[PDB]
Scaffold this motif. Structure first.
Motif, PDB file in Angstrom:
ATOM      1  N   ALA A 265      15.333  67.134  27.208  1.00 58.60           N
ATOM      2  CA  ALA A 265      16.303  67.132  26.127  1.00 58.60           C
ATOM      3  C   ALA A 265      16.975  68.499  26.051  1.00 58.60           C
ATOM      4  O   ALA A 265      16.317  69.539  26.140  1.00 58.60           O
ATOM      5  N   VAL A 266      18.299  68.499  25.910  1.00 59.00           N
ATOM      6  CA  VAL A 266      19.066  69.737  25.830  1.00 59.00           C
ATOM      7  C   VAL A 266      20.104  69.585  24.729  1.00 59.00           C
ATOM      8  O   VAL A 266      20.441  68.475  24.311  1.00 59.00           O
ATOM      9  N   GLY A 267      20.626  70.722  24.273  1.00 55.07           N
ATOM     10  CA  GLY A 267      21.644  70.705  23.242  1.00 55.07           C
ATOM     11  C   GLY A 267      23.043  70.552  23.807  1.00 55.07           C
ATOM     12  O   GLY A 267      23.248  70.464  25.024  1.00 55.07           O
ATOM     13  N   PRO A 268      24.045  70.544  22.929  1.00 59.64           N
ATOM     14  CA  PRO A 268      25.439  70.514  23.401  1.00 59.64           C
ATOM     15  C   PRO A 268      25.802  71.766  24.190  1.00 59.64           C
ATOM     16  O   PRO A 268      25.194  72.833  24.039  1.00 59.64           O
ATOM     17  N   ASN A 269      26.811  71.609  25.049  1.00 56.45           N
ATOM     18  CA  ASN A 269      27.427  72.706  25.792  1.00 56.45           C
ATOM     19  C   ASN A 269      26.472  73.329  26.805  1.00 56.45           C
ATOM     20  O   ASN A 269      26.599  74.503  27.146  1.00 56.45           O
ATOM     21  N   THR A 270      25.527  72.536  27.317  1.00 53.96           N
ATOM     22  CA  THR A 270      24.514  73.015  28.251  1.00 53.96           C
ATOM     23  C   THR A 270      24.931  72.718  29.695  1.00 53.96           C
ATOM     24  O   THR A 270      25.204  71.563  30.043  1.00 53.96           O
ATOM     25  N   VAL A 271      24.970  73.758  30.541  1.00 48.14           N
ATOM     26  CA  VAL A 271      25.190  73.544  31.970  1.00 48.14           C
ATOM     27  C   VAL A 271      23.984  72.811  32.544  1.00 48.14           C
ATOM     28  O   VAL A 271      22.841  73.267  32.400  1.00 48.14           O
ATOM     29  N   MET A 272      24.232  71.687  33.220  1.00 51.65           N
ATOM     30  CA  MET A 272      23.154  70.840  33.736  1.00 51.65           C
ATOM     31  C   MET A 272      23.075  70.808  35.247  1.00 51.65           C
ATOM     32  O   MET A 272      21.976  70.705  35.806  1.00 51.65           O
ATOM     33  N   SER A 273      24.218  70.852  35.920  1.00 54.71           N
ATOM     34  CA  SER A 273      24.244  70.533  37.339  1.00 54.71           C
ATOM     35  C   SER A 273      25.445  71.237  37.944  1.00 54.71           C
ATOM     36  O   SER A 273      26.415  71.564  37.246  1.00 54.71           O
ATOM     37  N   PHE A 274      25.363  71.493  39.251  1.00 54.56           N
ATOM     38  CA  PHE A 274      26.434  72.161  39.968  1.00 54.56           C
ATOM     39  C   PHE A 274      27.124  71.195  40.914  1.00 54.56           C
ATOM     40  O   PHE A 274      26.486  70.341  41.539  1.00 54.56           O
TER      41      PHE A 274
ATOM     42  N   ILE B 295      28.559  70.637  35.718  1.00 49.77           N
ATOM     43  CA  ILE B 295      28.524  69.579  34.711  1.00 49.77           C
ATOM     44  C   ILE B 295      27.904  70.206  33.472  1.00 49.77           C
ATOM     45  O   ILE B 295      26.806  70.780  33.545  1.00 49.77           O
ATOM     46  N   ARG B 296      28.636  70.160  32.359  1.00 47.49           N
ATOM     47  CA  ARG B 296      28.198  70.717  31.083  1.00 47.49           C
ATOM     48  C   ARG B 296      28.173  69.609  30.032  1.00 47.49           C
ATOM     49  O   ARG B 296      29.111  68.807  29.952  1.00 47.49           O
ATOM     50  N   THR B 297      27.106  69.554  29.228  1.00 42.29           N
ATOM     51  CA  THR B 297      27.035  68.504  28.212  1.00 42.29           C
ATOM     52  C   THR B 297      28.079  68.727  27.121  1.00 42.29           C
ATOM     53  O   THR B 297      28.386  69.862  26.737  1.00 42.29           O
ATOM     54  N   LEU B 298      28.622  67.622  26.613  1.00 37.53           N
ATOM     55  CA  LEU B 298      29.484  67.639  25.439  1.00 37.53           C
ATOM     56  C   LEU B 298      28.689  67.546  24.148  1.00 37.53           C
ATOM     57  O   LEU B 298      29.153  67.990  23.088  1.00 37.53           O
ATOM     58  N   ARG B 299      27.516  66.937  24.225  1.00 38.54           N
ATOM     59  CA  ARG B 299      26.658  66.702  23.081  1.00 38.54           C
ATOM     60  C   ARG B 299      25.227  66.928  23.531  1.00 38.54           C
ATOM     61  O   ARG B 299      24.948  67.079  24.724  1.00 38.54           O
ATOM     62  N   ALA B 300      24.319  66.971  22.561  1.00 40.39           N
ATOM     63  CA  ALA B 300      22.906  66.952  22.898  1.00 40.39           C
ATOM     64  C   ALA B 300      22.585  65.675  23.663  1.00 40.39           C
ATOM     65  O   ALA B 300      23.133  64.607  23.379  1.00 40.39           O
TER      66      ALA B 300
END
Ligand SMILES: Nc1ncnc2c1ncn2[C@@H]1O[C@H](C[C@@H](N)CC[C@H](N)C(=O)O)[C@@H](O)[C@H]1O
Ligand SMILES: CN1CCC(=C2c3ccccc3C=Cc3cc(O)ccc32)CC1
Length: 247
Positions: A121-130, A205-210
């Motif tokens: 689980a991660v919060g919004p605006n989190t870089v996840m993948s390249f 890839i950065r999350t828009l939401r949690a």
């Protein structure tokens, strides 16, 4: 006498170390720090370019000097920017930050193939993948069948990133995984610029939401009626019609 510099990139990563006489990030104790401000590649850099970074953890920063703990193992990385024909010097060496945050599995979207999923689980605006890949021209992408463009992502006005066959199989290429995220018009992620110590200038890839653990990560591929290339897949036609029916 001595001077330590912290350079913060817009994407949230950073470079930290003592600058040399010319004010350059050159030495044996330089580190790239990922956007979590914890995962680091520590070691030899020349003018900010990673020559030999070892996986490490940033533990604390007492009075500006960071303290790094080397991770047990022989995980070593170097600047390794792709070309038009070479995706990576080590296609099977994963990125350690990405490996903590995503995994590939069968998509939950019917007939989409594999997809990209959050490990934690991660919060919004989190870089996840390249999103690394070979570097080709818009001309090449536009001048071929769009069925060859499912892994293309425009980097800028000069360069398109691609993960061509056979690198679309994780058993052949797992250095980055951004190409495995499927499309949605209700996406939970976006593509964003990223300056990577190994891959160079790419997208992430950065999350828009949690996002929860094991949620599928999706990005809007675009909003045009047809993708780049010659002679749109129906799955996209169907989703675009449904998107346009909401307004
Ligand atoms: N919403 C969707 N519905 C159906 N197929 C999709 C969708 N999004 C992506 N795809 C498929 O995934 C391809 C794009 C890839 N970048 C995504 C990873 C791909 N699913 C794979 O298994 O490698 C597309 O060309 C389609 O084959
Ligand atoms: C991460 N990239 C994956 C491929 C992609 C496509 C595309 C290509 C082939 C088949 C299908 C697609 C799907 C949608 C699309 C819409 C646009 O308006 C511009 C481009 C695309 C762009 C983003």
């Amino acid at each position: 006498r001595h001077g330590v510099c912290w350079i913060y990139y817009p994407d949230g990563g950073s470079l930290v170390g003592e600058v040399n006489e010319d004010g350059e990030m050159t030495g044996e104790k330089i580190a790239y720090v990922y956007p979590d401000e914890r995962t680091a590649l520590y070691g030899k850099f020349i003018d900010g370019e990673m020559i030999e970074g070892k996986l490490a953890t940033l533990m604390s920063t007492e009075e500006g000097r960071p303290h790094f703990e080397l991770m047990p193992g022989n995980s070593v990385y170097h600047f390794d920017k792709s070309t038009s024909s070479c995706i990576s010097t080590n296609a099977l060496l994963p990125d350690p930050y990405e490996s903590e945050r995503v995994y590939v599995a069968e998509s939950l979207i019917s007939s989409a193939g594999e997809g990209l999923f959050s490990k934690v689980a991660v919060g919004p605006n989190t870089v996840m993948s390249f999103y690394n890949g070979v570097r080709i021209t818009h001309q090449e992408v536009d001048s071929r069948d769009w069925a060859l463009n499912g892994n293309t992502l425009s980097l800028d006005e000069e360069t398109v990133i691609d993960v061509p066959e056979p690198y679309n199989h994780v058993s052949k290429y797992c250095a980055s995984l951004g190409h495995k995220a499927n499309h949605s018009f209700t996406p939970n992620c976006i593509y964003d610029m990223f300056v990577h110590p190994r891959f160079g200038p790419i997208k992430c890839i950065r999350t828009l939401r949690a996002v929860e653990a094991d949620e599928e990560l999706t990005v809007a591929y675009g909003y045009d009626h047809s993708p780049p290339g010659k002679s749109a897949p129906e799955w996209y036609q169907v989703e675009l019609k449904a998107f346009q029916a909401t307004q």
